[PDB]
Amino acid sequence: LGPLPPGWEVRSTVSGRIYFVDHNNRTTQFTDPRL
């Protein structure tokens, strides 16, 4: 709904699914904060 945290890599696939792969804290999430 707003901000994107630094360290967040957006690993996207053509299916239309963005899925989070943060290289810093090492975390994975389907909820994208930019939306």
């Binding site: 690993r11 996207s12 899925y19 792969v21 290289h23 994975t28």
Partner: peptide, 13 residues
């Protein structure tokens, strides 16, 4: 979609 995979560095055009 299903539960999220492990983390990789991204392929994004």
């Amino acid at each position: 979609d299903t539960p999220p995979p492990a983390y990789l560095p991204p392929e994004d055009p």
